[PDB]
Design a binder for this molecule. Structure first.
Ligand SMILES: NC(=O)C1=CN([C@@H]2O[C@H](COP(=O)(O)OP(=O)(O)OC[C@H]3O[C@@H](n4cnc5c(N)ncnc54)[C@H](OP(=O)(O)O)[C@@H]3O)[C@@H](O)[C@H]2O)C=CC1
Ligand SMILES: NC(=O)C1=CN([C@@H]2O[C@H](COP(=O)(O)OP(=O)(O)OC[C@H]3O[C@@H](n4cnc5c(N)ncnc54)[C@H](OP(=O)(O)O)[C@@H]3O)[C@@H](O)[C@H]2O)C=CC1
Lengths: 240, 242
């Protein structure tokens, strides 16, 4: 993949404040993208923004949207503020996500559970709905959901996370079918990656023996770039 | 498939008991000897189904109210305590209750309707399953059945919240299926298109006499609550292969 793969492409990334979303941003940016950052923490996004600026020379915008509490109006309002500065979106990476409770179904807490489906499904549904006009105004728009392997096959103790990655996958498949030959619409399964969500989940696992968000990026770029134009409605594993 | 003493002295709770496919499961289970618990949100609809199952079997079911759009974790724990009082287990639970919501472009889906659908179909069904898992554990071969749709396995245009909710349902089932291996049977049914009112809402033009009725598709519904399926778990089954 050439260093100018994403020149003059407008790419928005959620959960840009930390982890995979952080790394996706910086990288899309190094590949020449106009990146847009979303998160819920102004102080964290300022730092990401700052670091990308020191990296590439361009200061990316960040917008605030807490996905737990956000409504359709706020999301629609966020679309408004993005149209102010940008003619279109070429890519939207829905990367934000809440892990919630990792325990037996009998132990799973119902408020954390309703927080998980709020952030991973609803708020992500709502926000997609608002950004679709800007994605359609692009020459080949790319919408990406982040799944997980419990989004394909429920294992014990994954609970609310899992149900919500299943929903992410069907949500992706409805959309891809509706935007056939208008939009690329896909899922990425990152697989286990050196982040603080992964570690919460696996206290004992050694993170240094994991691939970093950096290492898993070839797929993140491929799905935003011209070589995936013909691909839609699929779930790609960053680590097959 | 079966025989009329099959579900003899098995105790089965059916949500969405007051109409469509749950009404029929409840009615059908009871004619095969089951002691049925009817759940729904409409007292009169429920009164009627109970009365009808009485006049058919001579055993009158008990019915309970839970509005899965509005219930809290507490509301469901209470109910389960209520059940635990008259009842010494649950050999079976059919989560039939469902909300269709808007069938329309993802661009057009109402956000509140979207959230209503996930609440009935994923969260309340979650919270309800949770409150009843102890009683189910008390069965010798308890059966937990969810209801999916073919768009819970493969999203298609215009299914919005309901396709999302049914994937989340298959997902949910697989987790539970993983944690209760050799403890519970935990499967899904895909009914197929069935002559009910939810179906009609989605296919207003469809001639409903071209569909199978709830009663045409009951074998599977019956197969899964009895002993012929005892070692099978973690799977989605089609009531209409095709
Ligand atoms: N890391 C891994 O091994 C795997 C991760 N995934 C998925 O990858 C994606 C990224 O996860 P990862 O980078 O690992 O995790 P992190 O927890 O490190 O970061 C997740 C991002 O989501 C944001 N976020 C969480 N809740 C909200 C909210 N309510 N409003 C706005 N933003 C929110 C966080 O913001 P902030 O923290 O700044 O508040 C953060 O920016 C997620 O979809 C995750 O589910 C899938 C498989 C494996
Ligand atoms: N019919 C079909 O072609 C197919 C059906 N299905 C699934 O089969 C199941 C049965 O559907 P079907 O019989 O067709 O539908 P019906 O609409 O005719 O019945 C659905 C049942 O769920 C109950 N319900 C809805 N919302 C709530 C709520 N908030 N609280 C408590 N109960 C509620 C209804 O109660 P009430 O009447 O009292 O309001 C009703 O008893 C559903 O889960 C549906 O998803 C899946 C694929 C195909």
């Amino acid at each position: 993949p050439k260093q100018d793969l994403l020149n003059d492409r407008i790419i928005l990334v959620t959960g840009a404040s930390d982890g995979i979303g952080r790394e996706a941003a910086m990288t899309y940016a190094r590949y020449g993208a106009t990146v847009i950052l979303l998160g819920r923490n102004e102080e964290k996004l300022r730092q990401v923004a700052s670091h990308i600026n020191e990296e590439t020379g361009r200061q990316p915008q960040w917008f605030i949207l807490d996905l737990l509490t956000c409504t359709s109006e706020d999301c629609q309002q966020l679309a408004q503020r993005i149209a102010v500065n940008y003619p279109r979106l070429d890519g939207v990476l829905h990367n934000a996500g809440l892990l919630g409770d990792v325990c037996p179904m009998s132990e799973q807490d119902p408020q954390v559970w309703q927080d998980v489906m709020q952030v991973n499904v609803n708020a992500t549904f709502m926000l997609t709905q608002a950004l679709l006009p800007l994605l359609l105004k692009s020459d080949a728009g790319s919408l990406v959901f982040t799944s997980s392997s419990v989004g394909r096959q429920g294992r014990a103790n994954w609970g609310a996370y899992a149900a919500s990655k299943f929903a992410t996958e069907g949500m992706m498949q409805v959309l891809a079918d509706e935007y056939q030959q208008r939009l690329r619409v896909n899922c990425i399964n990152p697989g286990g990656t050196r982040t603080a969500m992964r570690a919460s989940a696996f206290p004992t696992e050694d993170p240094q023996k994991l691939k970093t968000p950096a290492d898993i990026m070839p797929l993140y770029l491929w799905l935003m770039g011209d070589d995936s134009r013909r691909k839609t409605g699929m779930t790609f594993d960053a680590q097959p």
